[PDB]
Write a protein that binds this ligand. Structure first.
Ligand SMILES: COc1ccc(Oc2cc(NCCC(F)(F)F)c3ncc(-c4ccc(C(=O)NC5CC5)c(C)c4)n3n2)c(F)c1F
Length: 254
């Protein structure tokens, strides 16, 4: 019912995430302030798991200085037995927010886009490619989006719809994250991801890599947004827009 880390006591309001050897709790400290604590049980864990968990805290810790669109890490306790990570708690994950919304304020959708670009840009400048970017991986906190993780440990959970063609064709570059950001932006403008409607999964992966399968970009008022989506959703990573290009794009600048 309570969690201690580097002395201090947090009371559990509830569990919010799960996977493999870990749990995430929404939590209060003694001044009744809210945090997310991640718990990782290490007693039964492979060295490939441990290394991933160590790499994650190292990276999360270094990236704090670089951008406020990365989740804050206040403190952590690491032992042969466990990890506790005390991190900022958000209002809601972007996936659960998207399922509520009847529709999105176009100026809200742009503001989020910017936030996602700045987060992912920051991890790219430290030589990290997330590779598994879904809306679940972003947090709304003070009307801004913050990236939650780095693709370095991958157990945690609150689809194959966000998968770039080249990750499937590989029997990966930063351009891989542009595809998935493109799928999230497409979801935010059309109320679906591009291959949402394809029903079975084997048939989805066929669509994602098949050149003859054209994606539909319906006419919308925001001609720029349409351009961002068509550039993010090119199957050829080499012909696909980069993050530094995306930040110079009229959609975020004009
Ligand atoms: C991909 O795995 C997950 C994705 C989204 C999740 O949802 C949420 C939802 C939050 N909303 C507050 C909702 C509340 F409390 F009001 F119900 C929230 N606040 C801080 C963190 C949070 C912060 C850090 C991390 C984390 O593990 N980051 C990695 C160390 C870099 C995680 C998984 C969640 N989250 N996470 C989740 F629980 C996951 F495990």
């Amino acid at each position: 019912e309570c969690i201690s880390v580097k002395g201090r006591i947090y009371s559990i309001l509830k569990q919010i995430g799960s996977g493999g050897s870990s749990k995430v709790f929404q939590v209060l400290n003694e001044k009744k302030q809210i945090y997310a604590i991640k718990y990782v049980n290490l007693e039964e864990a492979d060295n490939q798991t441990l290394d991933s968990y160590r790499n994650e805290i190292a990276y999360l810790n270094k990236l704090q200085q670089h951008s406020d669109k990365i989740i804050r890490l206040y403190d952590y306790e690491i032992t042969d037995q466990y990890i506790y990570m005390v991190m900022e708690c958000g209002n809601i994950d972007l996936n659960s927010w998207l399922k509520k919304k009847k529709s999105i304020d176009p100026w809200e959708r742009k503001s989020y886009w910017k936030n996602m670009l700045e987060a992912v840009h920051t991890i790219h400048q430290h030589g990290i490619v997330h590779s598994d970017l879904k809306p679940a991986n972003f947090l709304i906190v003070d009307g801004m989006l913050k990236l939650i993780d780095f693709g370095i440990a991958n157990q945690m959970q609150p689809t194959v719809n966000y998968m770039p063609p080249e990750a499937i064709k590989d029997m990966i570059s930063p351009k891989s994250d542009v595809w998935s950001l493109g799928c999230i932006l497409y979801y935010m403008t059309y109320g679906k991801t591009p291959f949402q409607q394809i029903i079975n999964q084997i048939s989805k992966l066929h669509a994602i890599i098949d050149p003859n399968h054209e994606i539909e970009f319906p006419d919308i008022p925001e001609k720029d947004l349409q351009d961002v989506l068509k550039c993010c959703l090119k199957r050829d990573p080499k012909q696909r827009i980069s993050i530094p290009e995306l930040l110079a794009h009229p959609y975020v600048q004009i």
